[PDB]
Design a protein around this nucleic acid. Structure first.
Length: 118
RNA sequence: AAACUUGAGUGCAGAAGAGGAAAGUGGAAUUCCAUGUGUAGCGGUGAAAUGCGCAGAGAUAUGGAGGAACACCAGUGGCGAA
């Protein structure tokens, strides 16, 4: 029931709509996750830096209960809550060994959706 | 009718180019499908809802299938009659 993973990876997906934080082992197996939506943030509040922090703190705390002490951070997306999430991991007591940006970029690939005229 | 070389061509020696046609080879990303981890949302908006998910979604890891387009370079840069 209790795992013992000392070293793990924290994945922060920050979008204009939401922030999701999943903490995984180095092999990509998930330990815990939290989101602005999961904590009951709604609408504009979901994308706020505060909501991102609270999501990060919740996910970190649960992961530490599995014995995680050190984390490597991977960030994806352009949302406002990326930095707050990274600070929250440190605040939760996990140590951030490395921070890396993994947001996907095509080398001129698929056609994007139409621009919103309104 | 007879000359001439300046126009227009030819030769010779150089120069650059997303000019065109046909094969072949890549890497990024999207979608789908398959499994592992995992959990109560995800997604979306001015705000919502429809939708998707709890028959395990989204996320994360790995593998496979397929199509389309070629980041950076890249510039009143280049090439072409358009």
């Amino acid at each position: 029931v209790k795992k013992n993973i000392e070293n793990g990876v924290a994945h922060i997906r920050s979008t204009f709509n939401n922030t999701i934080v999943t903490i995984t082992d180095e092999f990509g197996n998930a330990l815990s996750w939290s989101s602005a939506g999961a904590l009951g943030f709604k609408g504009s509040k979901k994308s706020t830096p505060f909501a991102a922090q609270m999501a990060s703190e919740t996910a970190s705390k649960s992961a530490m209960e599995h014995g995680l002490k050190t984390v490597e951070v991977t960030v994806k997306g352009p949302g406002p809550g990326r930095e707050s999430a990274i600070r929250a991991l440190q605040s939760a007591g996990l140590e951030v060994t490395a921070i890396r940006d993994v947001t996907p970029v095509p080398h001129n690939g698929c056609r994007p959706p139409k621009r919103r005229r309104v």
